Specification:
Protein name (chain B): Pre-mRNA-splicing factor 8
Order of helices and strands of chain A: HEEHHHEHEHEEHEEH
Helix content of chain B: 25-40%
Protein name (chain A): Pre-mRNA-splicing factor SNU114
Structural class of chain A: alpha+beta
Shape of chain B: elongated
Order of helices and strands of chain B: HH
Radius of gyration of chain A: 24 Å
Shape of chain A: elongated
Distance between the termini of chain B: 47 Å
Largest interface: A-B, 6 and 7 residues
Subcellular location (chain B): Nucleus
Family (chain A): Belongs to the TRAFAC class translation factor GTPase superfamily. Classic translation factor GTPase family. EF-G/EF-2 subfamily.
Number of helices of chain B: 2
Function (chain A): Component of the U5 snRNP complex required for pre-mRNA splicing. Binds GTP.
Strand content of chain B: under 5%
Number of domains of chain A: 2
Oligomer: part of a larger assembly
Amino acid sequence: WDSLASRNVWSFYNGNVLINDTLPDEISPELLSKYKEQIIQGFYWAVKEGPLAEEPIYGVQYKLLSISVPSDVNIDVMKSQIIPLMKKACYVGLLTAIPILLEPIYEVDITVHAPLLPIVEELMKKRRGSRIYKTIKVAGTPLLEVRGQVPVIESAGFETDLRLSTNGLGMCQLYFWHKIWRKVPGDVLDKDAFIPKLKPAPINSLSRDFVMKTRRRKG
Amino acid sequence: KKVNGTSYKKWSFDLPEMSNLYRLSTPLRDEVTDKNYYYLFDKKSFFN
């Protein structure tokens, strides 16, 4: 990590991380110190919410590049100004940095008999994510350990699909460990892609479809 | 030893007796013995 940047880590968000990064940090650090908490309070405030859907932000680092301050600060730099200003700036930055949506994914632990494997493979394909991280023969028993991953939005009913398609044989557990949000396929901000109502979204964009339905709920 | 007596209520067998009986009855009785096969075929699910 850059030695200045590492020394300039201000704090983490309600999540990611804030760094100070400009010549004015050297020019007026005392002045700037007076405004840290106002910034600090705001950032948790701003990152806890979001510019697309009022949802929290992941995997993002911010660096203060410039900060102009009112001549003779006659109690001018008030929290009423800077907190929202800072919030706005964050939002703009995210947008111009090319935003994306992230989707949570489960770890799919499936236990089956060997000849029921092909079934399982097809199920994964059908659901959407269709990802199996590993297959391990369970030494000592007529069983396989199947580890996969599955998009939570495509998880509804998944377990019963398994149970029914395998005729009662084998079983599934979904556990959230690692808490990793994978990039949602489509570009975060393109108008064109979506197709009419009641149709599962085409693969190219699941990011654009995701925002609008959430956008409407927000207002 | 085998029976209640004359009346014929109540019965009990030896192991080999049971095993012969079981083996002979196999063609007529075949089921997926595990509770698991009837995931959505039990009474409760029908009621629902």
